[PDB]
Design a protein around this ligand. Structure first.
Ligand SMILES: Cc1cc2nc3c(=O)[nH]c(=O)nc-3n(C[C@H](O)[C@H](O)[C@H](O)COP(=O)(O)OP(=O)(O)OC[C@H]3O[C@@H](n4cnc5c(N)ncnc54)[C@H](O)[C@@H]3O)c2cc1C
Ligand SMILES: Cc1cc2nc3c(=O)[nH]c(=O)nc-3n(C[C@H](O)[C@H](O)[C@H](O)COP(=O)(O)OP(=O)(O)OC[C@H]3O[C@@H](n4cnc5c(N)ncnc54)[C@H](O)[C@@H]3O)c2cc1C
Lengths: 113, 113
């Protein structure tokens, strides 16, 4: 019983991590790509819910949600990828917020510093 | 121009990561220690704020907030360590919340699955 109910960390986890993708450079270096890739892989090892970890790991290594080098090309590809991952999880949970990738871009860019 | 104002990611970041520490095993294996250690080091590479990343990296490599092997001993040590890191950032920002470690444990344990 090492897991915590999603009520406390679920949304915070999504918001923080979407913000992370929007802080990615428009034109990243080889180091930026390596660092962010390692972060998102490690993220799967620490989600406070076993089933969540298993599902996440499956998503980032299969289909269009797979974390590949193409996903790390730029801010656009990284933000789109995580957006897709979030939708993949939503669908598995039988929900769909009908939010377009553009709605998300407009939302997070409103917080650009 | 890659940063985001803290209003969107600050609180979410603390909440999600404190939750991560409470999901850590009571009696971790060498593998668990390595995986969580790598995650918390990588977290410093992706905060969407330049000086925030620098401060965090300095906090986890020096002083009482250093991420040493002892911090990874068990759930108690890892959760206390991140509570200390949060207080270190608070002190740097001249913010005082007065929350005790016991208050934090009570809050997150109430969501124990
Ligand atoms: C990596 C990760 C894996 C998870 N895996 C599981 C799991 O396997 N099983 C389980 O029970 N729970 C899982 N969760 C939790 C879950 O996805 C929810 O956070 C939770 O069920 C709470 O639901 P919610 O309806 O508040 O919405 P969230 O999905 O918490 O609410 C997110 C908010 O973001 C918006 N949003 C919706 N879709 C998108 C999108 N595609 N992009 C950007 N914003 C969007 C809306 O504004 C919405 O209110 C996971 C969380 C994370 C962070
Ligand atoms: C690693 C990291 C580094 C950051 N660096 C900076 C920075 O350099 N400059 C800047 O302006 N902002 C920074 N921020 C943001 C900042 O820490 C706040 O999140 C933000 O100012 C909003 O403040 P808030 O009052 O909601 O409090 P947070 O500090 O967001 O609010 C956390 C909430 O957690 C609780 N809490 C407070 N202390 C503790 C504790 N020790 N342990 C557990 N819970 C506690 C209270 O319930 C509180 O409402 C950083 C965030 C992270 C996640």
């Amino acid at each position: 019983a090492n897991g915590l109910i999603t009520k406390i960390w679920g949304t915070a986890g999504w918001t923080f991590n979407h913000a992370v993708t929007f802080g990615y450079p428009l034109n990243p270096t080889s180091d930026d790509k390596r660092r962010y890739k390692n972060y998102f892989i490690s993220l799967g090892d620490v989600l406070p819910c076993r089933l969540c970890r298993e599902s996440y790991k499956k998503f980032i290594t299969t289909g269009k949600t797979a974390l590949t080098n193409e996903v790390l090309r730029n801010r656009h590809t990284l933000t789109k990828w995580f957006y897709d991952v979030h939708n993949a999880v939503n669908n598995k949970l039988e929900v769909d917020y009908g939010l377009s990738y553009e709605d998300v871009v407009n939302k997070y860019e409103s917080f650009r510093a």
